[model samples]
Target: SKDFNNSYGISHITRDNMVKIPQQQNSDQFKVPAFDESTIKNIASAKGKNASGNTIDLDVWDSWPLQNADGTVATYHGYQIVFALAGDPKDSNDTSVYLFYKKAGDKSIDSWKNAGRVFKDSDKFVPNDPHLKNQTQEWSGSGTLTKDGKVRLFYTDYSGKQYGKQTLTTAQVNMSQPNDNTLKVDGVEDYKSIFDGDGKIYQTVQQFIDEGGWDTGDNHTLRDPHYIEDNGHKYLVFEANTGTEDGYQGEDSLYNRAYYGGNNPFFQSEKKKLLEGSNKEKASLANGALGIIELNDDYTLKKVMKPLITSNTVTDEIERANIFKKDGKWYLFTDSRGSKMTIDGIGQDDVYMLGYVSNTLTGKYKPLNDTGLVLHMDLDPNDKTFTYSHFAVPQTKGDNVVITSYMTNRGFYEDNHSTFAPSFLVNIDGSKTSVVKDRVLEQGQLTV
Candidate 1:
């Protein structure tokens, strides 16, 4: 029988009970405050453009440790990292992948250098596929760095109108030049083995949603692809289309109703259902964040407890879930709202904020209280702005856990949209659990 505490419902216990357990918080303890608007700042607003103009919505997907020789933590500064697409997917010429590096002992933007494109659509090295060519193929979601030192980026290649039609591809980022900060497609590798002869890992992408295609014209977006290693087996966790093809069509039909206006009919019906199902399945699988493939002594997967906060409410589309260990317990963090669409538009908020689950990686996730809206572009009365797509690793800088975020602001005046300089900084902790302000890069500074 499962132990039940009257206050919290479930009692903390394992079959063996060898590990020390901590007090669990009551449901009443979970209270998220209104996000502080002043914490937001536009980091990339200084320069006329980012490291490159095309890469405006730069999102840092996953940040991992690139250890040194002695294994004593070489340089806290320079960690090899990867980010998502920075520009419009429709414009193939501007679409690109950006990489960055930090030098050991250096904590300022001066130490971080722009590593070039690791992969791009125009790169001749990448094979041409009908799905990739017709659809705007861009990189999004969490990526994993294999034990062999190869960075495997798992992203959805959105090509068609249907949702499940989305394809998954893994590309390797070149990290040979640690100091010079040069990345190219020379090291890109694809894992075609995951898919059987049918070339499909998921039966149907819409199945991930619960409503089972109760809505139509609703597309499925894959979120947060992380790798888990247990019992020598490597598994990937991501939110994909779980609804049947027929179900999606059925859901699409309901959109004509007045309530479904402006919302994807298919998504409205399936979003919550898909999130619940994905969380349950992922938790049972016992995966970690940041695609960390945990392994046993024999290099096998450990049948551990699943993650706690599997589902979140930031957006119908959630990706880039990163897990890190601080102190003794593990914390799962992710970029809730991406820059895919801005607040003024039909999309979710255009800022990068962090959310965390309490204990279990596979259980329920709660956004940090008061930490909402950690990174955002402060839109002036006349100016429009957006935050970097992602947040880098949470590093311990001086007295605070300094994280890196980019800022981009564009002006629509004169029928022209231009980029700005990219700014880098060590974040200052706001008065919240997961929220922080950009103390290093003072607000309104045009230049880094």
Candidate 2:
């Protein structure tokens, strides 16, 4: 009874459910419209100010609003707080979490101000163990405004020694506001590594190195730790890969091949038998998963739970995993690129913000909009505008959610991908969704 169709809680994005979202769409349902040059405006305070009082222009991307416990944007006093990945324009990997803020009701990108690096002079984040070298470069993660008016930031700590290794780390930020227009990061404390991977249910860097290092074309990730609270339980959802035993589900696994040899007529039982153990079926073992880990009351590791969803035999990355609760249903969102996918027609230009829905937090999730193609960016390498990292921000209006992402020129004349792209609205009516063609918001605006 544990056949491909009966695999509960596990979901797949096959051609049967996925529709051909042409590059040129007549309707504005899922397509991200062309880049608007007029929307570009630099926030003067976006420059990175160091402890020495020197400032440098930063290329920023992948931002998350400081949220309340329920995962909505939080406001301190009358200001809205946000965290983003900013780095030197030349070095994309030289990134760290930088704080930004604007007045509670402001929607203009110019209104947002930067508070410099959240961990500019903190050595507490360095791993105490010799094997885990400190790579202070912070990646994407969510933050929450605690009851005490402080901020708890959970972020990915990249490993310096290991090539593709990452660990989940947390920090407590104390803030001070001398006036209504300014919010500053007074201090960052309690910084330490909380989780890397158990190697049983989650892939560890050691296992990655054992399997052929970084050249495997397979993505081994346990990053993007997003925090949320449901009922009375606390959990962190992140991007991960299938484990090795009860952990790893490699190519030969029945469930893995079943997806490749889908249940469609084109892949009947006999044809499926032909692919059961075939090398063609095993051509791509990239199993990207949306993993969850529970936390104790104090935000310490409590348990490493099963993944909420997995993309085995599909693609190598499902990044920026996020969850939103609306109308008694859980909407799980992730960013994926078609270039890493093993699908028939999907190519590098097909970047998607895939969405899934579930009745309960840990329940079986079904694809949203039939194939989970919520937001699609038809990337033109020559003029790549809004590239990736699309997030679903719940709007105050009925069932309307705004989609936000970053702008990138890629290789065009200018390099402005460091800033935010224009925000747009997508109405999520239960399982069906449509992009609001006429409702484009300002750049980097997420109204709580």
Candidate 3:
């Protein structure tokens, strides 16, 4: 695999993202449009359905930009590069992650079309950990396009756990040649985790539930791993939940393993004693955190740093965070089911793609605006047909990458009714409000 550098890629071994930090992103002009419902709707529902009679509701929630080792955007299947999730009938577990591209002259990213499916959970390469195989029913996560023209996919097989561990896994495929309709993989395998992420105190799933008082006997979270190659150092930033912040406010990381057998990495720096005893509402809002793990030359555990980015506006469950830097400012992106926005009407199963910004990689990240809401799918609550929208990933077009998300109804974890939208060509008036693109202010020295 090769490496590309983010505009603000990690500092010499001193800083970076394990997420590959995904070197394939657009420059300063990148900005995701806000939520809009009427661009593409179900006027012709004749093209999708399942044996269960479920209408084929389509939604491509997240997009990953592809690039070369030189750090410049790369091309695949003869077009601009990008990989996004595609499927029919929202909430359908039967779907695939598709690679898409734009025609040589296609004007915008929205105009780009789909290519084919890349990988899925059912594929043989996908690991089926005996203890947790039956649990993993679905798949979702992001990946990076490497130098040898191979794409490395790190994902969360929903319910795919290992000894009560986070279910993040990996697979690789050669993009050098794309099958007429999909890119197949050489083989899929399990990604070794440093820990179940229960810290040193509570190690197993049962103990975690008992100690955290989380009530639910489920370890339904933990996946989404990112790769970042900084200077000469590499890191992996994946997502995991640490409930009952008592004395367990912490983080972990790992390195090489015997493919299928690697013991847990040690618990490193992690965090402070959280906002202990904060209101249930406040504590919930403050639970969003990024698990930063530094990997050694052998890709093993070095140290762990858990920096949290809280959301006081809506529900605080943060998942699949994408950390990007352009024009010297780092932006954190995540999709949350957080409802009950401080200034909203209905907030259930909502699509809120939000996060904060920072001057440094490991520092306090403040919210987008007054409400702390960056991008909202259901801005117009009264509108019922449109249920949700999120996964506003940027597909670098020309000037800037288009930040877009899925639009659907109900299930924000996914949905049955939906559509997607992007920030319609940003920087209209230069306002720092959540509604407009601020890259202009965050990047260029030129004045309008």
Winner by TM-score: 2
Error of 1 at 282 (Å): 25
Error of 2 at 80 (Å): 0.7
The per-model lDDT (C-alpha) reads 0.35, 0.74, 0.40
What TM-score does structure 1 among the candidates reach?
0.51
Instruction: Put down candidate 1 lDDT per residue, 1-448, tens digits, no spaces.
Output: 2211110111111101100101111121211212223344222311112434443434232232332211112232235443434444344333444554454444343343455555544542355443444444444544555556566555555544443444544555555653444433355654221210011222234342343442632334544445443334544445432222111123222222221112344334433343355322322221112222233333233332222322112123345644443442344445543333111121233334444434443443333443223333323323433443344344433223433333333444421222212323423332234322333443212122
State the local distance difference test value for candidate 1.
Answer: 0.35
Candidate with maximal lDDT = 2
lDDT per residue for candidate 2 within 26-137, as digits (tens), equals 3578887666774475555778744344666667788888888877778788888889987775554567788999987877888889887788644543546432245746
Candidate 3 residue-wise lDDT, 1-448, digit = tens: 1111211211111101111111211122222333333334321211333436464545555455554422234555555545555566444555545655554444443445444455444564344443334443334555565555556665554442433344445556544434543333344443333333445312235544454534432233455555565556655555554344322222111111110011223101101111122223333223234556566644445775554443221222466666655445555666655343221232454455554566766665654432234444434444423433333333233323334444343432322344333333232111132334443111000111
Query: At residue 136, what lDDT does model 1 achieve?
Result: 47
Superior by lDDT: candidate 1 or candidate 3:
3
TM-score preference between candidates 1 and 3, better one? 3
**Between the candidate structures 1 and 2, which one is better when assessed by lDDT?**
2
Error of 1 at 229 (Å): 5.8
On the 0 to 100 scale, the lDDT of residue 64 in model 2 is 89
